[PDB]
Protein backbone atom coordinates (compact mmCIF):
# COMPACT_ATOMS: atom_id res chain seq x y z
CA UNK A 1 0.00 0.00 0.00
CA UNK A 2 1.75 3.15 -1.21
CA UNK A 3 0.26 6.68 -1.15
CA UNK A 4 1.31 9.92 -2.86
CA UNK A 5 0.13 13.43 -2.14
CA UNK A 6 0.63 15.79 -5.07
CA UNK A 7 1.21 19.40 -4.06
CA UNK A 8 0.37 22.18 -6.51
CA UNK A 9 -1.29 25.20 -4.89
CA UNK A 10 -1.78 23.96 -1.37
CA UNK A 11 1.79 24.26 -0.07
CA UNK A 12 1.07 23.80 3.61
CA UNK A 13 0.55 21.20 6.33
CA UNK A 14 -2.29 22.92 8.10
CA UNK A 15 -5.85 22.58 6.70
CA UNK A 16 -4.89 19.93 4.15
CA UNK A 17 -7.91 17.56 3.92
CA UNK A 18 -6.50 15.70 0.91
CA UNK A 19 -3.15 14.97 2.57
CA UNK A 20 -4.82 13.90 5.82
CA UNK A 21 -7.16 11.60 3.90
CA UNK A 22 -4.31 10.04 1.94
CA UNK A 23 -2.89 9.11 5.35
CA UNK A 24 -5.61 6.63 6.15
CA UNK A 25 -4.38 3.05 6.14
CA UNK A 26 -1.58 4.29 3.91
CA UNK A 27 1.53 2.30 4.98
CA UNK A 28 3.58 4.66 2.80
CA UNK A 29 3.21 8.38 2.12
CA UNK A 30 5.21 10.51 -0.30
CA UNK A 31 4.71 14.21 -0.95
CA UNK A 32 5.56 15.31 -4.48
CA UNK A 33 5.82 18.61 -6.34
CA UNK A 34 6.32 18.84 -10.10
CA UNK A 35 8.10 21.89 -11.56
CA UNK A 36 5.82 23.81 -13.94
CA UNK A 37 7.40 26.87 -15.65
CA UNK A 38 3.91 28.30 -16.46
CA UNK A 39 2.74 28.83 -12.82
CA UNK A 40 -0.81 27.64 -13.53
CA UNK A 41 -1.28 30.62 -15.88
CA UNK A 42 -0.74 31.76 -19.48
CA UNK A 43 2.86 32.97 -19.01
CA UNK A 44 6.43 32.15 -18.22
CA UNK A 45 7.50 33.80 -15.07
CA UNK A 46 10.38 35.93 -13.69
CA UNK A 47 12.94 35.82 -10.82
CA UNK A 48 10.78 37.03 -7.89
CA UNK A 49 7.91 34.66 -8.68
CA UNK A 50 10.27 31.69 -8.87
CA UNK A 51 12.18 32.63 -5.70
CA UNK A 52 8.86 32.83 -3.84
CA UNK A 53 7.90 29.33 -5.00
CA UNK A 54 11.28 27.75 -4.20
CA UNK A 55 11.09 29.19 -0.65
CA UNK A 56 7.56 27.72 -0.38
CA UNK A 57 9.09 24.38 -1.33
CA UNK A 58 11.97 24.69 1.16
CA UNK A 59 9.68 25.50 4.09
CA UNK A 60 7.42 22.63 3.09
CA UNK A 61 10.46 20.37 2.85
CA UNK A 62 11.80 21.58 6.21
CA UNK A 63 8.41 21.16 7.91
CA UNK A 64 8.09 17.68 6.47
CA UNK A 65 11.50 16.83 7.96
CA UNK A 66 10.18 17.57 11.45
CA UNK A 67 7.60 14.85 10.75
CA UNK A 68 10.50 12.57 9.70
CA UNK A 69 9.68 12.79 6.01
CA UNK A 70 10.66 14.73 2.87
CA UNK A 71 9.39 16.70 -0.10
CA UNK A 72 10.04 15.06 -3.47
CA UNK A 73 10.55 17.57 -6.28
CA UNK A 74 10.50 16.43 -9.93
CA UNK A 75 10.95 18.15 -13.31
CA UNK A 76 8.70 17.02 -16.15
CA UNK A 77 5.15 16.95 -17.48
CA UNK A 78 2.78 15.28 -14.97
CA UNK A 79 1.57 12.91 -17.72
CA UNK A 80 5.14 11.66 -18.09
CA UNK A 81 6.16 11.42 -14.46
CA UNK A 82 3.21 9.72 -12.78
CA UNK A 83 3.18 6.51 -14.90
CA UNK A 84 6.81 5.94 -13.88
CA UNK A 85 6.18 6.61 -10.19
CA UNK A 86 3.11 4.40 -10.22
CA UNK A 87 5.13 1.35 -11.24
CA UNK A 88 8.36 2.39 -9.51
CA UNK A 89 6.92 3.02 -6.03
CA UNK A 90 3.96 0.61 -6.24
CA UNK A 91 1.39 3.38 -5.78
CA UNK A 92 -2.23 2.65 -4.94
CA UNK A 93 -3.34 6.01 -3.52
CA UNK A 94 -2.92 9.49 -5.01
CA UNK A 95 -4.34 12.70 -3.56
CA UNK A 96 -4.72 16.31 -4.72
CA UNK A 97 -6.36 19.57 -3.81
CA UNK A 98 -9.13 20.28 -6.36
CA UNK A 99 -8.27 22.90 -8.99
CA UNK A 100 -11.23 24.71 -10.53
CA UNK A 101 -9.17 26.29 -13.35
CA UNK A 102 -10.02 24.99 -16.84
CA UNK A 103 -6.43 24.03 -17.64
CA UNK A 104 -6.09 22.32 -14.26
CA UNK A 105 -9.27 20.34 -14.81
CA UNK A 106 -8.02 19.07 -18.17
CA UNK A 107 -4.68 18.08 -16.64
CA UNK A 108 -6.31 16.39 -13.67
CA UNK A 109 -8.68 14.35 -15.81
CA UNK A 110 -5.78 13.06 -17.89
CA UNK A 111 -3.84 12.11 -14.76
CA UNK A 112 -6.92 10.56 -13.12
CA UNK A 113 -7.24 8.48 -16.28
CA UNK A 114 -3.61 7.24 -16.08
CA UNK A 115 -4.13 6.45 -12.41
CA UNK A 116 -7.33 4.46 -13.01
CA UNK A 117 -5.67 2.28 -15.62
CA UNK A 118 -2.95 1.63 -13.02
CA UNK A 119 -5.18 0.60 -10.11
CA UNK A 120 -4.57 3.88 -8.27
CA UNK A 121 -7.43 5.31 -6.20
CA UNK A 122 -7.58 9.11 -6.59
CA UNK A 123 -8.50 11.41 -3.71
CA UNK A 124 -9.72 14.94 -4.39
CA UNK A 125 -10.58 17.49 -1.70
CA UNK A 126 -11.65 21.11 -1.91
CA UNK A 127 -9.46 23.43 0.12
CA UNK A 128 -8.19 26.09 -2.23
CA UNK A 129 -11.54 27.90 -1.87
CA UNK A 130 -14.02 28.54 0.93
CA UNK A 131 -16.87 26.99 -1.05
CA UNK A 132 -17.67 24.22 -3.51
CA UNK A 133 -17.62 26.48 -6.59
CA UNK A 134 -19.99 24.21 -8.54
CA UNK A 135 -22.57 24.50 -5.77
CA UNK A 136 -22.44 28.27 -6.15
CA UNK A 137 -23.06 27.96 -9.91
CA UNK A 138 -26.02 25.68 -9.20
CA UNK A 139 -27.54 28.24 -6.81
CA UNK A 140 -27.21 30.81 -9.57
CA UNK A 141 -29.19 28.67 -12.00
CA UNK A 142 -26.39 26.82 -13.80
CA UNK A 143 -24.21 29.71 -14.98
CA UNK A 144 -21.68 31.61 -12.89
CA UNK A 145 -22.70 35.08 -11.73
CA UNK A 146 -21.59 38.00 -13.84
CA UNK A 147 -21.46 40.51 -10.99
CA UNK A 148 -19.68 40.44 -7.65
CA UNK A 149 -22.93 41.72 -6.09
CA UNK A 150 -24.97 38.71 -7.20
CA UNK A 151 -22.10 36.45 -6.06
CA UNK A 152 -22.29 38.02 -2.59
CA UNK A 153 -26.05 37.44 -2.39
CA UNK A 154 -25.53 33.76 -3.20
CA UNK A 155 -22.80 33.11 -0.62
CA UNK A 156 -24.79 34.86 2.13
CA UNK A 157 -27.45 32.11 1.78
CA UNK A 158 -25.07 29.15 1.95
CA UNK A 159 -24.32 26.60 4.66
CA UNK A 160 -21.94 27.53 7.51
CA UNK A 161 -18.38 26.40 6.77
CA UNK A 162 -16.97 23.18 8.22
CA UNK A 163 -13.84 23.64 10.36
CA UNK A 164 -10.31 23.42 8.89
CA UNK A 165 -8.94 19.86 8.72
CA UNK A 166 -6.65 18.83 11.57
CA UNK A 167 -3.10 19.84 10.72
CA UNK A 168 -0.69 17.04 9.81
CA UNK A 169 1.16 16.36 13.07
CA UNK A 170 3.22 13.37 14.26
CA UNK A 171 0.01 11.80 15.65
CA UNK A 172 -1.73 12.15 12.29
CA UNK A 173 1.02 10.27 10.48
CA UNK A 174 0.83 7.52 13.09
CA UNK A 175 3.65 5.22 11.98
CA UNK A 176 2.82 5.76 8.31
CA UNK A 177 6.24 6.05 6.76
CA UNK A 178 8.10 7.89 4.02
CA UNK A 179 10.98 5.80 2.67
CA UNK A 180 13.92 8.13 2.16
CA UNK A 181 16.94 6.76 0.29
CA UNK A 182 20.52 7.23 -0.84
CA UNK A 183 20.75 10.16 -3.24
CA UNK A 184 17.25 11.47 -2.31
CA UNK A 185 18.57 15.01 -2.64
CA UNK A 186 19.96 16.02 -6.05
CA UNK A 187 17.48 13.46 -7.38
CA UNK A 188 14.41 14.89 -5.61
CA UNK A 189 15.83 18.01 -3.96
CA UNK A 190 14.41 21.53 -4.13
CA UNK A 191 16.47 23.36 -6.75
CA UNK A 192 17.99 26.83 -6.38
CA UNK A 193 17.67 29.92 -8.61
CA UNK A 194 21.18 29.39 -9.95
CA UNK A 195 20.38 25.76 -10.79
CA UNK A 196 17.31 27.01 -12.68
CA UNK A 197 19.29 29.48 -14.80
CA UNK A 198 18.78 32.83 -13.07
CA UNK A 199 21.47 35.41 -12.37
CA UNK A 200 21.34 36.11 -8.64
CA UNK A 201 24.20 38.61 -8.49
CA UNK A 202 22.34 41.83 -7.74
CA UNK A 203 19.69 40.32 -5.51
CA UNK A 204 18.72 41.50 -2.06
CA UNK A 205 16.82 39.37 0.40
CA UNK A 206 13.18 38.95 -0.46
CA UNK A 207 10.70 41.48 0.88
CA UNK A 208 8.26 38.59 0.63
CA UNK A 209 9.81 35.36 1.89
CA UNK A 210 7.87 32.26 0.90
CA UNK A 211 6.30 29.41 2.81
CA UNK A 212 3.72 28.33 5.39
CA UNK A 213 5.89 29.43 8.37
CA UNK A 214 6.09 33.07 7.31
CA UNK A 215 2.40 33.03 6.32
CA UNK A 216 1.28 31.84 9.78
CA UNK A 217 3.53 34.42 11.42
CA UNK A 218 2.17 37.17 9.17
CA UNK A 219 -1.38 36.03 9.86
CA UNK A 220 -0.88 36.47 13.62
CA UNK A 221 0.57 39.95 13.11
CA UNK A 222 -2.22 40.92 10.69
CA UNK A 223 -4.97 40.00 13.13
CA UNK A 224 -3.22 41.93 15.89
CA UNK A 225 -3.00 44.99 13.64
CA UNK A 226 -6.77 44.76 13.10
CA UNK A 227 -7.50 44.12 16.78
CA UNK A 228 -5.89 47.46 17.65
CA UNK A 229 -7.88 49.64 15.24
CA UNK A 230 -11.45 48.20 15.12
CA UNK A 231 -1.70 56.47 2.18
CA UNK A 232 1.96 56.56 3.26
CA UNK A 233 2.20 52.85 2.57
CA UNK A 234 1.93 52.01 -1.08
CA UNK A 235 4.78 50.04 0.41
CA UNK A 236 5.03 46.33 1.19
CA UNK A 237 3.42 45.65 4.57
CA UNK A 238 4.97 43.15 7.02
CA UNK A 239 1.43 41.79 7.41
CA UNK A 240 0.54 41.33 3.72
CA UNK A 241 -1.10 37.98 3.06
CA UNK A 242 -1.88 37.83 -0.67
CA UNK A 243 1.08 35.84 -2.06
CA UNK A 244 0.54 33.29 0.76
CA UNK A 245 -3.10 32.75 -0.21
CA UNK A 246 -2.07 32.42 -3.85
CA UNK A 247 0.26 29.47 -3.15
CA UNK A 248 -1.72 28.04 -0.25
CA UNK A 249 0.93 28.75 2.35
CA UNK A 250 -2.07 30.19 4.20
CA UNK A 251 -5.39 28.36 4.01
CA UNK A 252 -8.22 30.71 3.03
CA UNK A 253 -10.57 28.74 5.30
CA UNK A 254 -8.28 29.24 8.32
CA UNK A 255 -7.97 32.96 7.59
CA UNK A 256 -11.77 33.06 7.34
CA UNK A 257 -12.21 31.37 10.76
CA UNK A 258 -9.62 33.62 12.41
CA UNK A 259 -11.44 36.64 10.99
CA UNK A 260 -14.89 35.55 12.19
CA UNK A 261 -13.66 34.80 15.70
CA UNK A 262 -12.06 38.23 15.98
CA UNK A 263 -15.22 39.91 14.74
CA UNK A 264 -17.34 38.06 17.32
CA UNK A 265 -15.25 39.33 20.20
CA UNK A 266 -14.62 42.92 19.14
CA UNK A 267 -18.29 43.22 18.10
CA UNK A 268 -21.68 42.07 19.44
CA UNK A 269 -23.04 39.85 16.70
CA UNK A 270 -22.41 36.61 14.85
CA UNK A 271 -23.58 38.43 11.75
CA UNK A 272 -20.55 40.24 10.31
CA UNK A 273 -21.18 42.05 7.04
CA UNK A 274 -19.73 40.32 3.95
CA UNK A 275 -17.17 43.15 3.65
CA UNK A 276 -15.24 41.36 6.43
CA UNK A 277 -14.25 38.72 3.88
CA UNK A 278 -13.95 41.11 0.94
CA UNK A 279 -10.47 39.75 0.25
CA UNK A 280 -11.50 36.11 0.35
CA UNK A 281 -14.79 36.53 -1.61
CA UNK A 282 -13.38 38.68 -4.45
CA UNK A 283 -10.83 35.90 -4.95
CA UNK A 284 -13.53 33.24 -4.81
CA UNK A 285 -15.73 35.12 -7.24
CA UNK A 286 -13.13 35.01 -10.01
CA UNK A 287 -12.47 31.27 -9.67
CA UNK A 288 -16.24 30.75 -9.99
CA UNK A 289 -16.47 33.04 -13.04
CA UNK A 290 -13.66 31.27 -14.90
CA UNK A 291 -14.12 27.62 -14.07
CA UNK A 292 -16.28 26.86 -17.14
CA UNK A 293 -14.72 29.41 -19.51
CA UNK A 294 -11.42 28.21 -20.96
CA UNK A 295 -11.08 31.59 -22.73
CA UNK A 296 -11.49 33.74 -19.61
CA UNK A 297 -8.02 35.24 -20.16
CA UNK A 298 -8.71 36.22 -23.81
CA UNK A 299 -10.63 39.00 -25.49
CA UNK A 300 -11.81 37.13 -28.58
CA UNK A 301 -14.17 34.21 -28.10
CA UNK A 302 -14.64 35.27 -24.51
CA UNK A 303 -18.42 35.62 -24.16
CA UNK A 304 -18.19 37.89 -21.09
CA UNK A 305 -15.66 40.28 -22.64
CA UNK A 306 -16.41 43.44 -24.61
CA UNK A 307 -14.60 43.36 -27.94
CA UNK A 308 -12.48 46.51 -28.16
CA UNK A 309 -10.23 47.63 -31.06
CA UNK A 310 -7.03 48.01 -28.98
CA UNK A 311 -3.94 49.60 -30.56
CA UNK A 312 -0.75 47.65 -31.16
CA UNK A 313 2.50 49.27 -30.11
CA UNK A 314 5.28 46.95 -28.83
CA UNK A 315 7.56 49.86 -28.01
CA UNK A 316 4.97 51.67 -25.86
CA UNK A 317 4.13 48.48 -23.99
CA UNK A 318 7.83 47.92 -23.39
CA UNK A 319 8.18 51.39 -21.89
CA UNK A 320 5.15 50.78 -19.62
CA UNK A 321 6.44 47.41 -18.43
CA UNK A 322 9.95 48.72 -17.61
CA UNK A 323 8.57 51.79 -15.91
CA UNK A 324 10.12 54.14 -18.45
CA UNK A 325 6.90 55.97 -19.35
CA UNK A 326 8.04 59.42 -18.29
CA UNK A 327 5.27 59.54 -15.70
CA UNK A 328 6.82 59.25 -12.20
CA UNK A 329 3.70 57.89 -10.44
CA UNK A 330 3.46 55.10 -13.03
CA UNK A 331 7.18 54.42 -13.32
CA UNK A 332 7.51 54.21 -9.53
CA UNK A 333 4.77 51.59 -9.33
CA UNK A 334 6.08 49.49 -12.21
CA UNK A 335 9.51 49.78 -10.58
CA UNK A 336 8.30 48.53 -7.20
CA UNK A 337 6.55 45.73 -9.08
CA UNK A 338 9.71 44.65 -10.85
CA UNK A 339 11.91 44.89 -7.76
CA UNK A 340 9.63 43.35 -5.13
CA UNK A 341 6.74 41.53 -6.78
CA UNK A 342 3.83 43.24 -5.04
CA UNK A 343 2.07 46.56 -5.45
CA UNK A 344 -1.02 47.98 -3.77
CA UNK A 345 -4.44 47.35 -5.33
CA UNK A 346 -4.98 51.05 -6.06
CA UNK A 347 -1.56 51.11 -7.75
CA UNK A 348 -2.59 48.12 -9.93
CA UNK A 349 -5.62 50.21 -10.92
CA UNK A 350 -3.40 53.17 -11.80
CA UNK A 351 -1.01 51.31 -14.10
CA UNK A 352 -3.90 49.39 -15.69
CA UNK A 353 -5.83 52.56 -16.59
CA UNK A 354 -2.71 54.12 -18.08
CA UNK A 355 -1.89 51.07 -20.19
CA UNK A 356 -5.40 50.43 -21.39
CA UNK A 357 -8.39 52.77 -21.55
CA UNK A 358 -6.51 55.77 -20.18
CA UNK A 359 -3.55 56.71 -22.27
CA UNK A 360 -1.90 53.94 -24.28
CA UNK A 361 -4.99 52.11 -25.65
CA UNK A 362 -3.18 48.78 -25.42
CA UNK A 363 -5.05 45.51 -24.80
CA UNK A 364 -5.64 44.51 -21.19
CA UNK A 365 -4.20 41.09 -22.26
CA UNK A 366 -0.73 42.61 -22.55
CA UNK A 367 -0.99 44.14 -19.11
CA UNK A 368 -2.25 40.92 -17.63
CA UNK A 369 0.70 39.05 -19.11
CA UNK A 370 3.23 41.45 -17.54
CA UNK A 371 1.55 41.01 -14.13
CA UNK A 372 1.66 37.25 -14.53
CA UNK A 373 5.43 37.59 -14.98
CA UNK A 374 6.19 39.92 -12.07
CA UNK A 375 3.34 39.82 -9.50
CA UNK A 376 3.74 37.15 -6.76
CA UNK A 377 0.04 36.84 -6.06
CA UNK A 378 -1.23 36.76 -9.65
CA UNK A 379 -3.75 34.01 -10.25
CA UNK A 380 -4.95 33.22 -13.74
CA UNK A 381 -8.62 34.04 -13.23
CA UNK A 382 -8.25 36.82 -10.66
CA UNK A 383 -5.68 38.63 -12.77
CA UNK A 384 -7.68 38.29 -16.03
CA UNK A 385 -10.91 39.44 -14.37
CA UNK A 386 -9.28 42.49 -12.84
CA UNK A 387 -7.72 43.52 -16.09
CA UNK A 388 -11.03 43.09 -17.83
CA UNK A 389 -12.93 45.08 -15.27
CA UNK A 390 -10.29 47.82 -15.00
CA UNK A 391 -10.37 48.39 -18.77
CA UNK A 392 -14.19 48.45 -18.94
CA UNK A 393 -14.14 45.19 -20.89
CA UNK A 394 -16.37 43.35 -18.44
CA UNK A 395 -19.01 43.81 -15.82
CA UNK A 396 -17.91 42.26 -12.55
CA UNK A 397 -18.27 45.61 -10.81
CA UNK A 398 -19.22 49.28 -11.41
CA UNK A 399 -17.02 51.34 -13.71
CA UNK A 400 -15.14 54.25 -12.14
CA UNK A 401 -13.51 57.36 -13.62
CA UNK A 402 -10.15 56.62 -15.20
CA UNK A 403 -7.38 57.41 -12.70
CA UNK A 404 -5.14 60.35 -13.56
CA UNK A 405 -1.43 59.42 -13.84
CA UNK A 406 -0.59 62.68 -12.04
CA UNK A 407 -3.40 63.61 -9.68
CA UNK A 408 -3.95 60.22 -8.10
CA UNK A 409 -0.39 60.41 -6.86
CA UNK A 410 -0.89 63.95 -5.56
CA UNK A 411 -3.93 62.92 -3.52
CA UNK A 412 -2.06 59.89 -2.16
CA UNK A 413 1.04 61.85 -1.00
CA UNK A 414 2.12 65.32 -2.19
CA UNK A 415 5.60 64.96 -0.70
CA UNK A 416 6.20 62.22 -3.28
CA UNK A 417 8.08 59.95 -0.86
CA UNK A 418 7.00 56.85 -2.79
CA UNK A 419 8.31 58.29 -6.05
CA UNK A 420 11.71 59.26 -4.64
CA UNK A 421 12.04 55.86 -2.99
CA UNK A 422 11.72 53.87 -6.24
CA UNK A 423 13.03 56.53 -8.64
CA UNK A 424 16.44 57.74 -7.50
CA UNK A 425 17.16 60.02 -10.50
CA UNK A 426 14.19 62.19 -9.49
CA UNK A 427 14.95 62.54 -5.77
CA UNK A 428 16.03 66.20 -6.05
CA UNK A 429 12.84 67.62 -7.61
CA UNK A 430 10.54 69.72 -5.39
CA UNK A 431 6.92 68.73 -4.70
CA UNK A 432 5.84 71.31 -7.29
CA UNK A 433 7.13 69.33 -10.28
CA UNK A 434 7.50 65.87 -8.71
CA UNK A 435 4.50 64.40 -10.58
CA UNK A 436 4.95 66.53 -13.70
CA UNK A 437 8.77 66.81 -14.05
CA UNK A 438 8.61 67.77 -17.72
CA UNK A 439 7.08 71.01 -16.46
CA UNK A 440 10.33 71.84 -14.66
CA UNK A 441 11.91 75.10 -15.87
CA UNK A 442 15.05 74.14 -17.81
CA UNK A 443 17.13 75.32 -14.83
CA UNK A 444 15.29 73.31 -12.17
CA UNK A 445 16.36 70.19 -14.05
CA UNK A 446 19.95 71.41 -13.82
CA UNK A 447 19.58 71.72 -10.04
CA UNK A 448 17.82 68.36 -9.69
CA UNK A 449 20.65 66.90 -11.80
CA UNK A 450 18.17 65.16 -14.06
CA UNK A 451 17.30 66.31 -17.55
CA UNK A 452 13.88 65.36 -18.84
CA UNK A 453 14.64 63.28 -21.93
CA UNK A 454 18.23 62.63 -20.91
CA UNK A 455 18.29 61.07 -17.43
CA UNK A 456 14.59 60.48 -17.11
CA UNK A 457 12.37 59.76 -20.16
CA UNK A 458 10.17 62.28 -21.86
CA UNK A 459 6.46 61.70 -21.10
CA UNK A 460 5.49 59.15 -23.77
CA UNK A 461 2.03 60.65 -24.19
CA UNK A 462 0.38 64.03 -24.03
CA UNK A 463 -1.86 62.65 -21.30
CA UNK A 464 -4.75 65.11 -21.62
CA UNK A 465 -4.86 64.69 -25.40
CA UNK A 466 -4.75 60.89 -25.19
CA UNK A 467 -7.43 60.85 -22.47
CA UNK A 468 -9.89 62.97 -24.39
CA UNK A 469 -9.18 60.84 -27.46
CA UNK A 470 -9.53 57.44 -25.74
CA UNK A 471 -12.64 58.53 -23.85
CA UNK A 472 -14.22 59.24 -27.24
CA UNK A 473 -13.00 55.86 -28.50
CA UNK A 474 -14.87 54.28 -25.60
CA UNK A 475 -18.08 56.27 -26.06
CA UNK A 476 -18.26 55.06 -29.66
CA UNK A 477 -17.77 51.49 -28.36
CA UNK A 478 -20.52 51.56 -25.73
CA UNK A 479 -22.81 53.45 -28.09
CA UNK A 480 -22.52 50.60 -30.57
CA UNK A 481 -23.21 48.09 -27.80
CA UNK A 482 -26.53 49.76 -27.07
CA UNK A 483 -27.39 49.95 -30.76
CA UNK A 484 -26.89 46.21 -31.13
CA UNK A 485 -28.44 45.21 -27.78
CA UNK A 486 -31.52 46.93 -29.27
Amino acid sequence: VNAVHWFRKGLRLHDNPALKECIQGADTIRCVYILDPWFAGSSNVGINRWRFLLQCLEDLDANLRKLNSRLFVIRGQPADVFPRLFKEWNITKLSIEYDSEPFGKERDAAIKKLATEAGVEVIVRISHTLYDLDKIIELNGGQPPLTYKRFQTLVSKMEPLEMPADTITSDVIGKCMTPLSDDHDEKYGVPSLEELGFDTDGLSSAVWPGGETEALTRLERHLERKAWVAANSLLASPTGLSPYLRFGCLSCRLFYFKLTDLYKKVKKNSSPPLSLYGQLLWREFFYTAATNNPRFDKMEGNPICVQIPWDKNPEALAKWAEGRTGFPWIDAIMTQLRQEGWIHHLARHAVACFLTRGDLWISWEEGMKVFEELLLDADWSINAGSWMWLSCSSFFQQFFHCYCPVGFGRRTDPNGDYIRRYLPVLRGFPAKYIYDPWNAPEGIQKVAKCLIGVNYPKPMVNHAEASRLNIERMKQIYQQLSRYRG
Binding site: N44, F198, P303, V306, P309, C392, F399, C402, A464, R485
Partner: protein, 96 residues
Protein backbone atom coordinates in the same frame (compact mmCIF):
# COMPACT_ATOMS: atom_id res chain seq x y z
CA UNK B 1 17.03 45.04 -17.59
CA UNK B 2 15.80 42.49 -15.03
CA UNK B 3 12.70 41.42 -16.90
CA UNK B 4 13.62 37.95 -18.11
CA UNK B 5 11.60 34.83 -17.54
CA UNK B 6 12.30 31.12 -17.44
CA UNK B 7 11.10 29.51 -20.69
CA UNK B 8 10.92 25.77 -21.11
CA UNK B 9 13.81 24.90 -23.42
CA UNK B 10 14.39 21.55 -25.13
CA UNK B 11 13.10 18.49 -23.23
CA UNK B 12 16.42 18.65 -21.36
CA UNK B 13 16.40 22.07 -19.65
CA UNK B 14 14.99 25.53 -18.92
CA UNK B 15 16.18 28.59 -20.83
CA UNK B 16 16.48 32.07 -19.33
CA UNK B 17 15.34 34.69 -21.86
CA UNK B 18 13.43 37.95 -22.37
CA UNK B 19 9.65 37.49 -22.79
CA UNK B 20 8.29 37.74 -26.37
CA UNK B 21 6.74 41.19 -25.97
CA UNK B 22 10.14 42.47 -24.88
CA UNK B 23 12.04 40.62 -27.59
CA UNK B 24 9.56 42.07 -30.13
CA UNK B 25 10.02 45.65 -28.96
CA UNK B 26 12.81 48.00 -29.87
CA UNK B 27 13.99 48.74 -26.40
CA UNK B 28 17.27 50.55 -26.97
CA UNK B 29 18.16 53.54 -24.79
CA UNK B 30 16.77 56.34 -27.00
CA UNK B 31 13.18 54.95 -27.25
CA UNK B 32 13.17 54.40 -23.49
CA UNK B 33 14.04 58.08 -22.88
CA UNK B 34 12.93 59.78 -26.10
CA UNK B 35 9.93 57.95 -27.63
CA UNK B 36 6.53 59.62 -27.55
CA UNK B 37 3.34 58.47 -29.23
CA UNK B 38 2.52 60.52 -32.33
CA UNK B 39 -0.33 63.01 -32.15
CA UNK B 40 -3.18 61.62 -34.23
CA UNK B 41 -6.30 63.10 -35.80
CA UNK B 42 -9.35 62.28 -33.61
CA UNK B 43 -11.96 61.59 -36.28
CA UNK B 44 -9.59 59.60 -38.46
CA UNK B 45 -9.04 57.10 -35.60
CA UNK B 46 -12.75 57.02 -34.62
CA UNK B 47 -13.65 56.20 -38.21
CA UNK B 48 -10.86 53.65 -38.40
CA UNK B 49 -12.16 52.19 -35.10
CA UNK B 50 -15.73 52.15 -36.42
CA UNK B 51 -14.65 50.09 -39.41
CA UNK B 52 -13.28 47.55 -36.87
CA UNK B 53 -16.34 47.63 -34.65
CA UNK B 54 -18.55 46.45 -37.50
CA UNK B 55 -16.37 43.38 -37.69
CA UNK B 56 -16.42 42.88 -33.91
CA UNK B 57 -20.18 43.46 -33.75
CA UNK B 58 -21.38 39.83 -33.77
CA UNK B 59 -18.96 38.77 -31.09
CA UNK B 60 -20.06 41.35 -28.54
CA UNK B 61 -21.36 39.84 -25.30
CA UNK B 62 -24.99 38.77 -25.15
CA UNK B 63 -26.86 38.93 -21.87
CA UNK B 64 -29.37 36.28 -20.83
CA UNK B 65 -32.48 37.09 -18.80
CA UNK B 66 -30.76 36.25 -15.51
CA UNK B 67 -27.66 38.20 -16.41
CA UNK B 68 -29.80 41.21 -17.38
CA UNK B 69 -31.32 40.97 -13.91
CA UNK B 70 -27.86 40.95 -12.23
CA UNK B 71 -26.71 43.87 -14.34
CA UNK B 72 -29.68 46.13 -13.60
CA UNK B 73 -28.44 47.52 -10.26
CA UNK B 74 -24.75 47.37 -11.14
CA UNK B 75 -24.59 48.66 -14.72
CA UNK B 76 -27.79 50.75 -15.19
CA UNK B 77 -26.72 51.75 -18.70
CA UNK B 78 -27.61 48.20 -19.87
CA UNK B 79 -31.40 48.51 -19.53
CA UNK B 80 -31.34 52.28 -20.07
CA UNK B 81 -29.48 52.39 -23.37
CA UNK B 82 -27.28 55.34 -22.53
CA UNK B 83 -23.56 55.51 -21.80
CA UNK B 84 -22.16 54.22 -18.49
CA UNK B 85 -21.80 57.05 -15.92
CA UNK B 86 -18.08 56.75 -15.34
CA UNK B 87 -17.34 56.98 -19.06
CA UNK B 88 -19.65 59.83 -20.11
CA UNK B 89 -17.15 62.64 -19.55
CA UNK B 90 -14.87 64.89 -21.59
CA UNK B 91 -11.59 63.34 -20.48
CA UNK B 92 -9.51 62.87 -17.36
CA UNK B 93 -11.80 64.20 -14.64
CA UNK B 94 -8.94 65.43 -12.46
CA UNK B 95 -7.45 67.56 -15.25
CA UNK B 96 -10.82 69.12 -16.11
Amino acid sequence: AGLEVLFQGPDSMYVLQDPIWLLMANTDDSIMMTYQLPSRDLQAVLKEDQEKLKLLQRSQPRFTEGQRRELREVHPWVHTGGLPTAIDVTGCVYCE
